[PDB]
Design a protein around this ligand. Structure first.
Ligand SMILES: Nc1ccc(S(=O)(=O)N(Cc2ccccc2)[C@H]2CNC[C@@H]2N(Cc2ccccc2)S(=O)(=O)c2ccc(N)cc2)cc1
Lengths: 108, 111
């Protein structure tokens, strides 16, 4: 699909996230071409999972790869590692995931 | 033009920005679809300024333009007229927001 760019309406998308620490959940993420690394809410991780620390406190880093499935594509997007928002339930699809699903940016 | 996305490659572009308080200048701006408002450096403005204080998701980093900003892209000849945009005072980033991408009818295509 073609997502129009609007300052009023955020270019969001419904995406299922597999953190491999809990059951796969479908969340609303933000399509961001400015973000290099995908952001995942800490609400999708188990209480046990160890995360690599790397603003230094607001975000953490995954220890295990994360699988992301879009409404249209059947095959999941594999991310070796991605940021973990531990504060504001932030889900942001960066270029690291947008590259794997042939995503581009068009300017007439 | 079709701009490919890569985590190890910032989707930057060359743009001419007119702050209407100095000489028009060319800067490297980051194509950002997660930005609802364009951010430009304070190195483009003069000394006097009058810029408004603002809060951006930080109360101290960004400032708001009192006058519109003329932004010109390589391909299209007609400029993008933002009524207002953010001014980075701490660093000197250049970020093309969705407010600018809308007027040039930019879109996000996902196969
Ligand atoms: N890897 C990585 C790098 C940066 C970020 S981000 O700063 O959180 N972040 C997402 C975001 C946060 C808060 C509100 C809206 C979007 C960036 C990504 N795109 C827009 C946003 N920004 C651009 C940016 C900043 C630093 C580095 C790279 C890009 S931004 O500065 O926060 C921003 C926020 C609001 C507006 N109007 C304009 C710009 C997230 C992950």
């Amino acid at each position: 699909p073609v997502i129009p760019l609007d300052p009023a309406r955020r270019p969001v998308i419904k995406a299922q996230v597999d953190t491999q620490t809990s059951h796969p959940k479908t969340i609303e993420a933000l399509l961001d071409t400015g973000a290099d690394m995908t952001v995942i809410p800490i609400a999708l991780f188990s209480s046990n999972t160890p995360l690599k620390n790397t603003t230094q406190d607001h975000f953490k880093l995954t220890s295990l790869p994360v699988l992301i499935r879009l409404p249209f594509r059947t095959t999941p997007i594999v991310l070796t590692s991605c940021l973990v928002d531990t504060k504001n339930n932030w889900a942001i699809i960066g270029r690291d995931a947008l590259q794997q699903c042939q995503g581009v940016l068009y300017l007439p």
